[PDB]
Design a protein around this ligand. Structure first.
Ligand SMILES: *[C@@H]1O[C@H](CO)[C@@H](O[C@@H]2O[C@H](CO)[C@@H](O[C@@H]3O[C@H](CO[C@H]4O[C@H](CO)[C@@H](O)[C@H](O[C@H]5O[C@H](CO)[C@@H](O)[C@H](O)[C@@H]5O[C@H]5O[C@H](CO)[C@@H](O)[C@H](O)[C@@H]5O)[C@@H]4O)[C@@H](O)[C@H](O[C@H]4O[C@H](CO)[C@@H](O)[C@H](O)[C@@H]4O[C@H]4O[C@H](CO)[C@@H](O)[C@H](O)[C@@H]4O)[C@@H]3O)[C@H](O)[C@H]2NC(C)=O)[C@H](O)[C@H]1NC(C)=O
Ligand SMILES: Cc1cc(OCc2n[nH]c3ccccc23)c(C(C)C)cc1Cl
Ligand SMILES: [Ca+2]
Ligand SMILES: [Cl-]
Ligand SMILES: [K+]
Ligand code: NA
Ligand SMILES: [Zn+2]
Length: 804
């Protein structure tokens, strides 16, 4: 029962043992507050602002906040008190002055952190709404800011806030949507309802728990809906005046705006100016309140959004009923994404394959694309959770998907929505960091919100729980408190084999027209096989292998590789193509040439016979024959140790990349270095498969079939310098292409490769870091750049969007 009292307990920080009634922030959410909660803890009398007449008033405990002489000591002045009653200036009116050191009251052990979060705050509001947000604009221009921050997918509220709290992808923390079904719980999670409150949904370790476990106290992060914003601000300010042994060090504020209005009015509806005004005034209240408590040059403030907002209306809805016949046999999680599962598990007459086929390229202008979850772009990291349905629909920006038209009129309401692919410009959101530990007047490049958890932990002197950020990749945001990152140690050292086998030892079923045999160039041919050109084709040192395996370094005139004796193919193949380089064809007589490698045993080689016998699987080459430096060097490209298994449908993509695109990138970027290789992720967890996890081999062999192929393409950021002679910062783009036996993903694939290939590759853009997880390799080990800068480079994603 709720029979006790909140007198002296308002917004208490510890949760009281039930059923003793509660006075903490969550009580309202559980219907468990004491009977006098509203009266005592949610006072509203006289508003939130001191006025001239209230100054020096006789304290009255009924007031929402206070203008009496004792209010600073009691910690409960209205935020504008010192301005009205003491002739002080608003914080926004003060010039900004660099904060070189924390300027905190006696008893403060560390600068507090306040996370000020705003729902639906699209990145471009910073520029487009600048005239109406003077407090936010001062934070932004005086502190450290990014032009935008990339959310996680789906670009919904709980998945993104819980990613901020934990540093984890939604697939790992478990909050994979604003709505979800868990098939093991046989339970559904919604925005409505009490289900979302069960701790069984929320995995990982959020910042507040990380803090508590290491002796740093945390304010509440979840604010009950009914508590107004002025009262949240005042609660944080009151907690900040607690005695040293009770005062938290980490605080959060949350606003439902501008998202709430953005849904109704669209992202730039005229109605949107006022919510931006109101958020700014709330920021003003906090800064004035901090400055009153002499904390405005002590506290680190993060102003951060969860996602942006796109124009979306009822009439831009695709209906599954217009594609399927058995539309009543499915359940759809609708909207700016789609997730489909059977309406009943006691129905084995349910075929995902027929459903996908019925949804693929059916209408010329189709505004979604179906995927099995394991085939989604690896950059989304959206598969490894039982709450993610096998069938996913990626919806075009500005559109919705729904099951049947009745779901739209029997559920126009709205003009804005969010949830799309996280590379979409309209879904980008904001980051500003302001305070003694952040830099002064500094712009940093856009980065992903998965990285912030490590930085908040550094800000608080905490050791972060295991997470998906790359610790040190955001060191450049901070004045001090930088983590000191170090390269992981190489686990496996390579072998450097010489010529050990005679041709006749091999029985691989391979042939080649190669017997058309001079000490000027015979000394040189041995030179190249020993590593003379290795400084040209391996520019950043050899990748380190971070797991236990057996592998060989193989040198060639045009390329170097790391050849795995366990997977029977290279883990990486590295080569440099200069701006000047020539493309040539595979000579007629060498169309089907494959040559045994005299450095590598028959027993650790692939064989041509398995490919002949496997009617589905063909093969390609990692270093492409088309880019050989001479007719003589081209023979190296046909070594058995350069070959990888490729479906004919995939060879269309691969050959166009190698024959056309590598050269175009070299021309555009003043040379490129390329590192290519296979990826095996049969259990779709984003991590390198062990040999015993492989589910497909080339028929009747031990040759494993990659699920994906990658390339990392590096050049000089200053493109006046050639890739191979670059003195400064690097520039990288990468991809992870799915290795698929059809091109059903590309609706225009029946046309020439020049109309569809590059579009596919763009969709499958990747971070170097994503490739490192998938390979157990560590790249860029020998450069002249600092390790923190290299970590930033490894987290870079080339998105192919236009400028914000
Ligand atoms: C992003 O960062 C995160 C965090 O670093 C990375 O995720 C980690 O990956 C690790 C390797 O996969 C994984 O390690 C495993 O942990 C098992 C213990 O699991 C529990 O305890 C931990 C620690 O407290 C906890 O965090 C886990 O939380 C998960 O599960 C709960 C529900 O139970 C959820 O609330 C929560 O959201 C989270 O779910 C996510 O992860 C699980 C997998 O753990 C997925 O299934 C979910 O879908 C979801 O994504 C757990 O509460 C431990 O038992 C494992 O050890 C077995 O396997 C290893 C290696 O394969 C082997 O060496 C061991 O000997 C052992 O094998 C034996 O057990 C097998 C399984 O029962 C059995 O089949 C064998 O026969 C053997 O007998 C393993 O070490 C770690 O838990 C997660 N952590 C998180 C939070 O996700 C993530 O990889 C990064 N992503 C990228 C792309 O880099
Ligand atoms: C800064 C932050 C705020 C936050 O929640 C804010 C919140 N309060 N009330 C809400 C109602 C709907 C939606 C969100 C909220 C969370 C949750 C995951 C706990 C995490 C983080 Cl990092
Ligand atoms: Ca894997
Ligand atoms: Cl959702
Ligand atoms: K074949
Ligand atoms: Na196609
Ligand atoms: Zn919303």
């Amino acid at each position: 029962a709720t029979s006790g009292s909140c007198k002296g307990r308002c917004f208490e920080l510890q949760e009281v043992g039930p059923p003793d009634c509660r006075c903490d922030n969550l009580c309202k959410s559980y219907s468990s507050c004491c009977h006098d909660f509203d009266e005592l803890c949610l006072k509203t009398a006289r508003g939130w602002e001191c006025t001239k007449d209230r100054c020096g008033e006789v304290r009255n405990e009924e007031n929402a906040c206070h203008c009496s002489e004792d209010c600073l000591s009691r910690g409960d002045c209205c935020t504008n008190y010192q301005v009205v009653c003491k002739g002080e200036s608003h914080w926004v009116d003060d010039d900004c002055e660099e904060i070189k050191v924390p300027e905190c009251p006696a008893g403060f052990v560390r600068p507090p952190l306040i996370i000020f979060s705003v729902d639906g705050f699209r990145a471009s509001y910073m520029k487009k709404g600048s005239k109406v947000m003077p407090n936010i604009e001062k934070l932004r221009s005086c502190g450290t800011h990014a032009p935008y921050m990339r959310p996680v997918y789906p670009t919904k509220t709980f998945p993104n806030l819980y990613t901020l709290a934990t540093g984890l992808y939604p697939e790992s923390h478990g909050i994979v949507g604003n709505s979800m079904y868990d098939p093991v719980f046989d339970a559904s999670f919604h925005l409505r309802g009490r289900e979302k409150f069960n701790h069984r949904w929320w995995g990982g370790q959020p910042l507040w728990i990380t803090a508590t476990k290491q002796g740093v106290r945390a304010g509440t992060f979840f604010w009950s809906v009914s508590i107004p914003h002025e009262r949240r601000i005042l609660t944080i300010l009151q907690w900040l005046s607690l005695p040293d042994n009770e005062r938290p060090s980490v605080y959060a504020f949350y606003s439902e705006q501008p998202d709430f209005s953005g849904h109704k009015y669209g992202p730039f509806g005229p109605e949107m100016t006022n919510p931006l005004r109101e958020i700014d005034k709330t920021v003003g209240q906090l800064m004035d309140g901090l400055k009153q408590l002499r904390l405005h040059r002590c506290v680190n403030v993060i102003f951060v959004g969860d996602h942006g907002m796109e124009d979306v209306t009822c009439d831009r809805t695709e209906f599954l009923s217009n594609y399927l016949t058995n539309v009543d046999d499915i359940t759809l999680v609708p909207g700016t994404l789609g997730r489909i599962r059977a309406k009943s598990i006691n129905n084995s007459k349910y075929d995902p394959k027929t459903i996908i086929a019925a949804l693929t390229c059916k209408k010329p202008d189709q505004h979604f694309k179906p995927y099995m979850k394991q085939h989604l772009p690896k950059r989304l990291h959206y598969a490894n959770n039982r709450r993610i349905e096998d069938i996913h629909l990626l919806v075009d920006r500005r559109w919705h998907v729904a099951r049947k038209p009745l779901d739209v009129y029997k559920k126009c309401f709205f003009q804005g929505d969010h949830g799309f692919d996280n590379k979409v410009n309209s879904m980008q959101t904001v980051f500003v960091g302001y305070g003694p530990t952040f830099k002064y007047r500094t712009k940093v490049p856009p980065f992903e919100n998965i990285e912030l958890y490590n930085v908040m932990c550094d800000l608080l002197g905490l050791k972060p729980a295991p997470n998906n950020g790359t610790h040190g990749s955001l060191n450049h945001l901070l004045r001090t408190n930088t983590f000191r990152p170090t390269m992981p140690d190489e686990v496996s050292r390579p072998n450097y084999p010489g010529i050990m086998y005679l041709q006749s030892e091999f029985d691989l079923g391979c042939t080649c027209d190669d017997k058309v045999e001079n000490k000027l160039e015979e000394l040189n041919k041995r030179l190249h096989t020993k590593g003379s050109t290795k400084e040209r084709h391996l520019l950043y040192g050899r990748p380190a292998v971070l797991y236990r395996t057996s592998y060989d370094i193989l040198y060639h005139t045009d390329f170097e590789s790391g050849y795995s004796e366990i997977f029977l193919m290279p883990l990486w193949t590295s080569y440099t193509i200069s701006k000047q380089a020539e493309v040539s064809s595979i000579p007629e007589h060498l169309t089907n040439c494959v040559r045994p490698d005299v450095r590598v045993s028959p027993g650790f080689s692939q064989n041509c016979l398995a490919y002949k016998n496997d009617k589905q699987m063909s093969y390609g080459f990692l270093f492409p024959p088309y880019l050989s430096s001479s007719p003589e060097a081209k023979y190296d490209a046909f070594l058995v140790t350069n070959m990888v298994p490729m479906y004919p449908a995939f060879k269309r993509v691969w050959a166009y990349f190698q024959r056309v695109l590598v050269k175009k990138y070299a021309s555009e970027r003043n040379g490129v270095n390329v590192i290519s290789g296979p990826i095996f992720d049969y259990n779709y967890d984003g991590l390198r498969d062990t040999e015993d996890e492989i589910k497909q081999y080339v028929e009747g062999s031990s040759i494993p079939v990659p699920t994906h192929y990658y390339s990392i393409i590096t050049s000089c950021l200053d493109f006046t310098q050639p890739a191979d002679k670059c003195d400064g910062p690097l520039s990288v783009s990468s991809f992870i292409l799915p290795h698929r036996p059809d091109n059903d993903e590309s609706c225009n694939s029946s046309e020439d490769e020049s109309k569809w290939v590059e579009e596919l590759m763009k969709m499958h853009t990747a971070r170097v870091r994503d490739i490192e997880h998938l390979t157990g390799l560590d790249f860029y080990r020998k450069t002249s750049r600092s390790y923190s800068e290299i970590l930033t480079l490894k987290t870079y994603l080339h998105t192919y969007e236009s400028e914000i």
